[PDB]
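Box S1 | Example of a co-folding query
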Amino acid sequence: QVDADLQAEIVGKYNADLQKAVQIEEKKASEIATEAVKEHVTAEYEERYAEHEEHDRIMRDVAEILEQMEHAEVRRLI
Amino acid sequence: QVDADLQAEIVGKYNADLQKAVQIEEKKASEIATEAVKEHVTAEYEERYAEHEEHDRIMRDVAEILEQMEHAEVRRLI
Ligand SMILES: [Ca+2]
Ligand SMILES: [Ca+2]
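Box S1 (continued) | Returned holo structure for calcium ion
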């Protein structure tokens, strides 16, 4: 589904940050924080791969990795 | 915390829609769908109460109601 290297890179760098964002109990602030983490990661990869031939596939993978990370932490806390 | 009438109005109108959005298994589409429901509700209330004296309080209540609805359904499915 997703590129395993892309998954390792994003999980490695950003999972702890996304976890902290999800762990904020005040739900508005948590939503804002989670979105901020996602937006940063998306922008980092967009900048890095803007002209790459597999750009569209990469960006779909980044979006899926981020959503799976969020889902895993929401599940894990519940 | 939130105005009980505002809560009843938004839950009554939009909970089933937010539930369907959260229930979509494909996580990107679910995220897009949930955000679309939230954006509509926020815009409806912003338009209705743009000049009201309690606008800021109302809009914070709308944001909290929407986040609580999302949390309740994510919890309920898990
Ligand atoms: Ca999500
Ligand atoms: Ca939320």
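The interface with chain A takes residues 27-28, 30-31, 60, 63-64, 67-68, 70-71, 74-75, 78 of chain B (CB under 8 Å). Residues A 67, 70; B 27, 31 surround calcium ion (ligand 1) (CB under 6 Å).
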